[PDB]
Write a protein that binds this ligand. Structure first.
Ligand code: HEM
Length: 294
């Protein structure tokens, strides 16, 4: 019951080259299965999967988190908060089959890193070593955030993941990717136009679009723009709160700053709860398919 310690353990004999191969397999499949979700591709859902398998972490007792790769167990993959993520897991199945040596946690997190980079986002340093843990270590449902809340809720929620205001605003920028699907979350619509290209569009849209608070077909309120975009109440709270607003403006006006801050916050999210040995390998920075000429 005491605060357990999760020590990163490198998959036996593996090094950078091995993980670059897994990265490449994921990236090649992202390119191949381009028709998914009306041609948005699997990039966005893989990022969401990485964030939800990591977002269960509780700094207070080190339960949940990316280390154990517990999403593979029914209790967690059936979490209502994870509806739709099965698509990401299905995508990674053939990858895990080809590289059975990689842990589930390493695969889920690497999937998110690969997706961000392939979608032209910033490089995200990634460390290996997550080790699969038993089904009884699977966190209970209810640790992921609700979308119908305000800024105070968001701020308090993220304190459990040890994220401050800047980290929260930076992480939310991932919503430039993909869209909400009524059947999955009770919300419908994309946050922007370039659904599968990682940019700071989320912030520009929050500030520049003309938003109207409306009710969707699930009878839930969401902010809609004439451009056909939407914002969840939690997204919109970032411009209602004065502290969050200042940061949103910063990122809307500095693409490089957003990339650097997102990279740090995303790696931190994916590494929360993990203790890396003094002699563990340095973080890996994978080359994109484009950089490799593949
Ligand atoms: C207050 C926190 C957050 C809330 C309430 C929230 C809520 C949601 C909801 C309701 C969806 C739609 C799911 C669906 O209908 O398919 C979604 C999608 C998504 N979220 Fe968030 N999210 C939050 C934070 C984040 C963070 C921190 C990241 C990652 C850094 C992230 C990345 C994504 C991505 C990429 C999608 C698109 C998935 C797809 O298109 O299939 N989210 N989120």
């Amino acid at each position: 019951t005491t605060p357990l310690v999760h020590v990163a353990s490198v998959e036996k004999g593996r090094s950078y080259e091995d993980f670059q191969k897994v990265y490449n397999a994921i990236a090649l499949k992202l390119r191949e299965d381009d028709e998914y979700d009306n041609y948005i591709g699997y990039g966005p859902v893989l990022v969401r999967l990485a964030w939800y398998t990591s977002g269960t972490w509780d700094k207070h007792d080190n339960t949940g988190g990316s280390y154990g790769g517990t999403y593979r167990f029914k209790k967690e993959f059936n979490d209502p908060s994870n509806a739709g993520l099965q698509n990401g897991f299905k995508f990674l199945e053939p990858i895990h089959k080809e590289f059975p040596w990689i842990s589930s946690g390493d695969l889920f997190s690497l999937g998110g890193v690969t997706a961000v980079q392939e979608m032209q986002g910033p490089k995200i340093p990634w460390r290996c070593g997550r080790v699969d843990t038993p089904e009884d270590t699977t966190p209970d449902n209810g640790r992921l955030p609700d979308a119908d809340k305000d800024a105070d809720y968001v701020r308090t929620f993220f304190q459990r993941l040890n994220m401050n205001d800047r980290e929260v605003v930076a992480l939310m920028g991932a919503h430039a990717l993909g869209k909400t699907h009524l059947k999955n979350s009770g919300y419908e619509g994309p946050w922007g136009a370039a659904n599968n290209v990682f940019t700071n569009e989320f912030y520009l849209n929050l500030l520049n679009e003309d938003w109207k608070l409306e009710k969707n077909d699930a009878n839930n309120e969401q902010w809609d723009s004439k451009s056909g975009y939407m914002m969840l109440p939690t997204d919109y709270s970032l411009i209602q709160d004065p502290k969050y607003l200042s940061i949103v403006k910063e990122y809307a006006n500095d693409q490089d700053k957003f990339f650097k801050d997102f990279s740090k916050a995303f790696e931190k999210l994916l590494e929360n709860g993990i203790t890396f040995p003094k002699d563990a390998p340095s973080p890996f920075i994978f080359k994109t398919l484009e950089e490799q000429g593949l």
